[PDB]
Amino acid sequence: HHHHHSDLTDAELAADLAADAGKLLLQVRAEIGFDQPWTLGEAGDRQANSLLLRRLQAERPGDAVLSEEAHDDLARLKSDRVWIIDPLDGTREFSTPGRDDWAVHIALWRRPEITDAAVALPARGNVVYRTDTVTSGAAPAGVPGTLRIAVSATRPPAVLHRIRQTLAIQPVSIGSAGAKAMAVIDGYVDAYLHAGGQWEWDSAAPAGVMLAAGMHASRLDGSPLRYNQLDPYLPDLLMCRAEVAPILLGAIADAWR
């Protein structure tokens, strides 16, 4: 009784879903193994999605759900509450022996902000980053005047090449969006930069955690990340320590001179 003021809070549920899906993914990895990476990744995407949809229907039956692994009936556009989930972020990484840079993303959009969210990194001790416990005021623990930026693409974007002419940057290759964003939270890198396209579920939970931590999350041009859009595709993003946002936004802006 009287457990939450206006049964888990939305943040507690996000964290519990992320952890539960994380545990299931670890079970799938062990059961199926690594000999057929395609099969392994398919099973992870499918089984984590099934768990998350089952539990969201049981525990939040009134909420809409936008999942990478389910059809999108657009009822969410009428809803004031939408879960935006990536049941397995970094499917290729999950499918590769020894890789721990893959994630589960659970975000709640409320009409609008990402108000509650969790990112699990299941292979990293099933650590779950969550908007109700993550802390701010983190510290630059490396060399002054240089930036470490998490990136991951088939091929680096032109904007990165441009800003490297002006700023000392070491790109840090990390799998999945969630692992790159949590590297910022951890202080392992200063920033996470992506251009060239991404879906809402790749960034909604990381952005929620980033903003709850007092850090910066925006489009490359500095405008807010928008969610629950008809087309749930985001052309680009910057997530970073608050202190380096002006430096990087400025460099990106200058890159287009």
Task: Rule CB under 5 A: say whether 86 interacts with Mg ion.
Answer: yes
Taking the complex as a whole, the smallest distance from the CB of residue 49 to Na ion amounts, in Å, to 13
Q: Is 68 in the site for Mg ion (CB under 5 A)?
A: yes
The footprint of Na ion on residues 24-43 (CB under 5 A) is 24
In the complex with Na ion, which residue's Cβ is closer, 94 or 192? Answer: 94
Judged by CB under 5 A, the residue of 89, 93, 200, 236 near Mg ion is: 89
| C-alpha to C-alpha distance for 234 and 161, rounded to whole angstroms | 21
Footprint of Na ion on residues 231-250 (CB under 5 A)? none
Asked whether residue 91 is marked as a ligand-binding residue, the answer is yes
Site for Mg ion in 188-207 (CB under 5 A): 202
68 assigned to a ligand binding site: yes
Residue number, nearest CB to Na ion: 24
Contact window for Mg ion (CB under 5 A) among 86-94, 116-124, 223-231, 245-253: 86-94
Contacts with Na ion by CB under 5 A lie at 24
